[PDB]
C-alpha cells in the first residue's frame, strides 16, 4: 500500500465537509477511521492519502444525501 500521508488539499476538503455536517475529527471521524482502518489514529494528519480519499468519499455521500437538521 501507498503510505503517502494525506495532503493539505484533501485535508481542507474533509474539514469543509465536517464543518458543513456539524461533525468533528475528535468526536466522529477519527473514531470511525480507527474502526474502519483497524488502527489507532489519533490525529487527522496521521491518515494516509489513500485512507483520506475514502473518508472524503464517505463525507460527500453524507453531505449530498440530505439536509443537516437543526
Amino acid at each position: 500500500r501507498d503510505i503517502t500521508p494525506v495532503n493539505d488539499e484533501t485535508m481542507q476538503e474533509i474539514n469543509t465537509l465536517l464543518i458543513a455536517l456539524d461533525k468533528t475529527w475528535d468526536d466522529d471521524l477519527l473514531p470511525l477511521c480507527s474502526q474502519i482502518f483497524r488502527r489507532d489514529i489519533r490525529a487527522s494528519s496521521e491518515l494516509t492519502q489513500a485512507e483520506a480519499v475514502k473518508a472524503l468519499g464517505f463525507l460527500k455521500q453524507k453531505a449530498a444525501e440530505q439536509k443537516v437538521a437543526a
Binding site: 455536517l21 466522529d28 474502526q35 474502519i36 483497524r38 475514502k54 464517505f58 463525507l59
Partner: peptide
C-alpha cells in the same frame, strides 16, 4: 468489515 463504501450512520 464495515468500510467507507458501506451505508454507515455518521
Amino acid at each position: 468489515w464495515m468500510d467507507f463504501d458501506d451505508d454507515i450512520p455518521f
